[PDB]
Amino acid sequence: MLILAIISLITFVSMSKLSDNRAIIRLINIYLILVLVLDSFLYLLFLNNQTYTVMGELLIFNSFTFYIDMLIYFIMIVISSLYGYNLYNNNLYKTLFEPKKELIILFLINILGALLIVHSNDFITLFVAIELQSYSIYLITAIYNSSYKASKASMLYFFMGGILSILIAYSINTYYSVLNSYTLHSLDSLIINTLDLNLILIALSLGLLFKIGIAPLHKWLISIYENTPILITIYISLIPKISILSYLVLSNISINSLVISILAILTLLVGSVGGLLQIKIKRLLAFSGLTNAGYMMLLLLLNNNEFSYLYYITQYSISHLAIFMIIIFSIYYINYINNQYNPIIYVNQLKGLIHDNAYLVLSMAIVVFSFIGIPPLLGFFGKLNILMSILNNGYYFISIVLIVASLISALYYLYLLNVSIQDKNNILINSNETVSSVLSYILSSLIILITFGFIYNSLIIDIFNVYFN
Amino acid sequence: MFIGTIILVLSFLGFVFNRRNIILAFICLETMLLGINLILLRNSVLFDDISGSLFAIVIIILAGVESAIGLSLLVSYYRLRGVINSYGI
Amino acid sequence: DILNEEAKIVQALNNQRELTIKMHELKREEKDYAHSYSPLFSDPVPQGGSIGKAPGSSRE
Amino acid sequence: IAHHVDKGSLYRLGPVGINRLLNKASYNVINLSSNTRSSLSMNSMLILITIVSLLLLVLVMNVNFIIVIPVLISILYILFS
Amino acid sequence: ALFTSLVGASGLGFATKFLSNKIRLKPAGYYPLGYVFSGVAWAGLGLVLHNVHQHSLEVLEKKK
Amino acid sequence: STPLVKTSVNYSYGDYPLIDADPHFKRVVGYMRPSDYGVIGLATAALPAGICFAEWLDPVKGKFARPSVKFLRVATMLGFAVGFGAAYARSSLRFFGVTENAREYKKDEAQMAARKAAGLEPYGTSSLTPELQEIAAKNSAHSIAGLFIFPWFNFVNHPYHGRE
Amino acid sequence: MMYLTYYFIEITIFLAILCTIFIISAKNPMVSILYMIALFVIAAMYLYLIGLGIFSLLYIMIYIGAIAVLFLFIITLLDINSTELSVKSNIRDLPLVLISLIVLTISGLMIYSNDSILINKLLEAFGNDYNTIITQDWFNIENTTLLTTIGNVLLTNNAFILLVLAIVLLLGIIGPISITMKHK
Amino acid sequence: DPIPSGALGQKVPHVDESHQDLLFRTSHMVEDLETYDEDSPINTSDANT
Ligand SMILES: CCCCC/C=C/C/C=C\CCCCCCCC(=O)O[C@H](COC(=O)CCCCCCCCCCCCCCC)COP(=O)([O-])OCC[N+](C)(C)C
């Protein structure tokens, strides 16, 4: 369905005028929804954890990959709604949020690259998919080329991602030079015992992991996140992280790695502490993303990680979308617009948001407490599953460091809510324009999922037991 | 494999310790890819195996597309500033 | 009646414990090649290229 | 007891001491790349330094894991303090 | 119970409609037909989940 | 039409007997039920209906306006595409024995018996060599699992259908 | 003959080292691009020497004929500032350059070995003191060369890879237009 | 009116169009705390004109 949409969109957009942009996005939006609800039944193929090799063993399809594909579709639906629908109908919002002509095509191609990374069974598939996603993401970072910061960010992305792509390619070719193979399927317990692949496989892991920005190579990506337009930042800080992490979770090439243990510890410490002095909202959220990446990095040290990874990545994606949507919604109530690409920059600009929109601040409180991990919000159960996994496997010191990082990052999570519930002197009385019905419903659905999803926990585990065992 | 390895290492060092211009960074990227392909092709010959050569062909095509996109990004960056600084990024 | 109800609840809890241990063990059992990799082309043994097929290159 | 312990040592192993500690640590880590002008050059130097240091650290671990603990402590001290 | 699952999922839809009304700075009962639409949609999702779970239990039982 | 490689025999993909592990495109379409055609029609209607309903909820330009005919036409074509994809997947899953397949199992038995009476190969004669038939089968087998990502179909008359 | 012709590979290696140094040290970045072209001719020489003259021709066709041409086109149209290599700017790197050179080169030679002991890992790198015995057989009756085999596997065994590459090339068209053209 | 504090209670700037001055561009400052905005509508008035 995705390839078809890309071909049709290139043709249609070529024959369309710049004023049709939003309409076109709306079309693709509904198309994606339809694919999600009419093609869902294919989950049945994976009953009892049946695995299928496809395309002459280039691709692998199982229940894990099918779930990740559904999640990526859902994320694309949510993010494309933010371009297809106006928050308000006034002139300022036309200036703030207008989709570029080719942006939707770049999004769909990037999604294709991500889904191909997830399903990669051979290293040539992995490299082609990785370069597809990387090139698309550079172009997505650059497409708002009136912005000085965005163009500079795109250059930085191109060069750092190119160096890391080279590291990945070199890893794959060393693996080939040792084994005369391009597939991890040729690895057996006997082969792992017989040969030292650790340096090759960790080089591959690090090449992949630095591309989503773990420590100590975190600042460049955080800079890119700060300096992109906000509706671009929502997309580019989530999709690559999901695709790369899902591939590493499914590949299991770093089990009980000392190097990955040390880098995960460093990532948790850097992400928690380095978020403390941040005053810009996007930098704060980027450090939050770094800390949650460290949480998920811990699951690369053990087998049977699928339930805890899938739970964590799902609830994290939901929370990330919710917090960015809340920040976008709050733009209407701020006094000072910093620029047209990042209308809101500083956390302090949210001061007194409760007096302008109380239920927006309730949504913020729910999301922030989920990030902290208060039960019965989804974030608590994500962290609980991760702790169960790591303590079952003997990672005691890392569990203590996880607790400490959670406590530390709670401070900068609470910063948002703290300023948001203080008093402001001039508060809103009335306004004739209402924010869009569609986007408000989407945000509310995300909030409700975060709040009440725990009710389905045991049902979810029951289904998981029959599709993943 | 010596020539590929030396080319890759020296190109990487040139990229990292580049403090002169941005074109050197572009060139060092291209030549690191060349070194990787050389290593791969020698192993392909020594195994008499087509998989290495297939990957090398794909690497060449992807290097072409990456060059095109990188230079498009550079031109878009130039459009707003009219010049590239010796820190131009 | 209080004792009977509490015992029924404890029995259901022990059932859930048994089920959890069972699923834990089953997930760790190794699967057949057809179920884990390929259910139609189920032979792991490769054939290689067919052009210059040399009598004597096949080895079990 | 009330001033030197309850509002002295116990706040030091508490909100006041932790606040001061986190302030210095956060400042140090964010300023890890403070004075630099060209983000490209600095970030490239960081990836080279990371790769080389990881190689040397792992070589040390193969030798003797106890010897690497002080080195990791020193690296953390460099980064956060 | 399926009926209880449908009531609960429809209540989730009602909560979604209420929160969306509030976030738009509108009264609770602003467009009451939206409550019906939201409840029906979320009840549909709850029904799908219920049926999938029931099939999963059936499969677990048939391997005995 | 002699297989070059060993395949599994009557393997269980689900709770129903296997009819065809890699059914031909012609058979997948030919075995479609009226319910599958209802799915095709439903998607063909749903996409333009969705675009109009979305317009109603939150107009692109403040004042409601029915979407132009160019977008309705594109929506109709793409909706047909989604519907055909779903119908193809439903029929395919009947061929794998993942959903209920009694009508299809009987019809396949009759069709194979008739062809055997006629002396023909059960899966047709191919214009490809057996090696290319094997490569084609290994490209198309279970490709319906990738329906979200890409379309791929069995257009080759190969012998690797997983039966006796 | 023999003395020169035995060390042709070693000469290509030495020339490659020299060409890389000249790329990095060039005053004019156009001269740097020319030294990159020289390095690619040297790589084509090496590929011919190891039996891959078809890849020699492909590299000449694509990396010089297309990529280097685009490089020169861009540096001609664009205003580039560059500073010269100097002690004041670059002697500060020498310690890190030396440590990184040694560590990266040694590790890049060691990643190929399968010996448990690190010193043996490095020693295997310099362990080809022997000649390969080239032998004949008669099982290949077709005239199948490297290009033909690549076509055979790329279009049949790995057709999916070709189609995905088509998408990548589509990106190489659509993206440049998206960020270098201003619509309306 | 009270001076904004941050997540650790440290002093935090207040921002409006004052921070887009002439003497505060090219400021030496970490990107985390730098307030000059080269995309601000008052610094980008006549760009590419
Ligand atoms: C009518 C078509 C509608 C289907 C459209 C689905 C869109 C997915 C979009 C967004 C993802 C949201 C989370 C998906 C739910 C997981 C279902 C499942 O049970 O996950 C399991 C695997 O559990 C896991 O690993 C852990 C999942 C972690 C979930 C964490 C969030 C929990 C809170 C969610 C509360 C549920 C809300 C219900 C509202 C009444 C896979 O189940 P399955 O692969 O067999 O497919 C299901 C059959 N299906 C295709 C028909 C739907």
Side-chain angles (χ1 to χ4, degrees), chain A residues 36-38 40-44 46 63 66-67 70-71 74 306-307 310-312 314-315 318 378 449 452-454 456-457 459-461 463-464 467-468, chain E residues 8-9 12 42-46 48-49 52:
Chain A
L36 244 194
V37 317
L38 287 181
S40 224
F41 67 99
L42 284 162
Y43 75 93
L44 270 174
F46 310 108
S63 55
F66 181 80
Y67 181 80
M70 278 177 101
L71 175 59
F74 161 92
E306 306 72 31
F307 181 74
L310 285 189
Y311 200 104
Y312 204 84
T314 303
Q315 66 81 31
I318 289 168
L378 289 182
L449 287 178
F452 298 106
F454 82 91
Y456 288 103
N457 264 3
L459 179 141
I460 289 334
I461 295 172
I463 293 168
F464 182 91
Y467 285 96
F468 291 72
Chain E
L12 289 178
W42 283 77
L45 270 310
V48 164
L49 214 51
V52 167

Side-chain angles (χ1 to χ4, degrees), chain D residues 34-37, chain H residues 19 21-31 33-36:
Chain D
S34 42
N35 62 74
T36 62
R37 186 81 55 187
Chain H
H19 290 253
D21 198 4
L22 246 234
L23 290 175
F24 295 96
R25 186 180 67 85
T26 76
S27 212
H28 87 299
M29 182 150 282
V30 63
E31 75 204 29
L33 304 194
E34 175 45 58
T35 187
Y36 183 85

Side-chain angles (χ1 to χ4, degrees), chain A residues 265-281:
Chain A
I265 290 183
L266 186 58
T267 304
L268 295 171
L269 291 182
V270 166
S272 50
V273 169
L276 287 169
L277 283 184
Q278 304 295 320
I279 58 168
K280 293 177 190 159
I281 298 176

Side-chain angles (χ1 to χ4, degrees), chain D:
Chain D
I1 289 158
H3 309 339
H4 300 346
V5 171
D6 276 73
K7 286 173 152 256
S9 292
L10 287 189
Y11 266 83
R12 283 310 187 77
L13 303 169
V16 167
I18 293 163
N19 193 269
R20 270 154 212 193
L21 186 288
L22 296 170
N23 216 293
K24 316 247 190 83
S26 188
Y27 193 90
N28 294 323
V29 316
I30 70 177
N31 290 291
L32 251 43
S33 71
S34 42
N35 62 74
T36 62
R37 186 81 55 187
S38 45
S39 45
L40 173 67
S41 187
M42 200 273 326
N43 282 305
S44 310
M45 239 162 282
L46 288 193
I47 175 267
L48 167 72
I49 288 158
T50 306
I51 288 185
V52 163
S53 281
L54 285 179
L55 298 155
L56 294 168
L57 281 175
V58 182
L59 158 69
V60 173
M61 326 210 207
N62 292 116
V63 183
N64 208 317
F65 178 77
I66 246 264
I67 308 287
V68 84
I69 292 153
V71 191
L72 304 177
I73 288 165
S74 322
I75 291 176
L76 271 187
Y77 180 82
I78 271 180
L79 295 196
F80 291 90
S81 161

Side-chain angles (χ1 to χ4, degrees), chain G residues 144-168:
Chain G
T144 312
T145 75
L146 203 56
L147 191 48
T148 287
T149 310
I150 284 132
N152 187 244
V153 297
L154 194 59
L155 284 148
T156 62
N157 300 86
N158 285 329
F160 184 79
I161 297 311
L162 182 64
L163 300 175
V164 179
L165 283 169
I167 298 307
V168 161

